[PDB]
Amino acid sequence: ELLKPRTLADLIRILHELFAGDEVNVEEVQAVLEAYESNPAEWALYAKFDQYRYTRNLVDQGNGKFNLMILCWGEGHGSSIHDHTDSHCFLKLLQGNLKETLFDWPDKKSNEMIKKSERTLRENQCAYINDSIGLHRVENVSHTEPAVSLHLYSPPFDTCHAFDQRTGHKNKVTMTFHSKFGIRTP
Ligand code: NI
């Protein structure tokens, strides 16, 4: 049975059950992430912000099947247009709101990448993306509220590509953790 996670620790327990095998039931994982009611006291340890850009804060290594992490987005902080390295990517809002802009994969001719659609992801909602769906940018467009999001990627990955919106040209980027298990990792 998929039960409602009572706490963040309970969610992580349930996730380890859902990833016990070699495949991923995307809709079940999204439903369980959405069902956890964000409780700031439970994730404050991981909500380590930087003034200048968003931070990635590892929470759980998923016994190697997945990385679960909390991203902290100051007012105005956003990401590149990026892919997700042939992995499943779930994004649940813990606090605030994020704007997600969807892009198709660029063709070979340098051209402006035009958005295909956009939406506003709200507290407690869980979105899903993978490379077959397309590329996205995620942005905290708020001038007054930090956003905090919980991301699960399976398999784990620590490199991806950023895309130049003006040309579609991509570059490989190595992502780093701001903290791991509540510990700042400079
Ligand atoms: Ni993403």
Distance 7 CA to ligand 1 centre (A): 25
Tokens of 106: 């660029």
Q: Are strands 126-129 and 88-95 parallel, antiparallel or unpaired?
A: antiparallel
Distance 136 CA to ligand 1 centre (A): 6
Distance 49 CA to ligand 1 centre (A): 18
Structural domains of the chain sorted by starting position, each given as residue range(s) with its CATH number in brackets: 1-186 (2.60.120.10)
Q: Report the C-alpha gap between 5 and 37 in whole angstroms.
A: 8
Q: Experimental method used, please?
A: X-ray
User: Would you say 177 and 55 are in contact if contact means Cβ atoms under 8 Å apart?
Assistant: no
Cα atoms found within 13 Å of the Cα of residue 48, Cβ hemisphere only? 18
Q: Report the C-alpha gap between 183 and 68 in whole angstroms.
A: 15
Nearest CA to 109 out of 180, 185, 166 is that of 166
Q: Can you list the pairs that 40-46 forms with residues at least 24 positions away whose Cβ atoms lie under 8 Å?
A: 40/94, 40/95, 42/7, 42/8, 42/9, 43/8, 43/70, 43/94, 43/148, 43/150, 45/182, 46/70, 46/179, 46/182
Distance 148 CA to ligand 1 centre (A): 14
Binding residues: 82, 84, 136
Report the Cα–Cα distance between both ends of the chain, in Å, rounded.
Answer: 41
Binding residues for Fe cation: 82, 84, 136
- Sorted by sequence, the CB contacts under 8 Å of residue 99 that are 6+ apart come out as 118, 119, 120, 121, 138, 139, 140, 141
Distance 109 CA to ligand 1 centre (A): 24
| Resolution stated for this PDB structure, in Å | 1.8
Cα atoms found within 13 Å of the Cα of residue 111, Cβ hemisphere only? 10
Nearest CA to 15 out of 152, 180, 177, 156 is that of 152
Distance 15 CA to ligand 1 centre (A): 20
- Sorted by sequence, the CB contacts under 8 Å of residue 35 that are 6+ apart come out as 2, 4, 5
Residue type, 154: S
Nearest CA to 125 out of 38, 48, 7 is that of 38
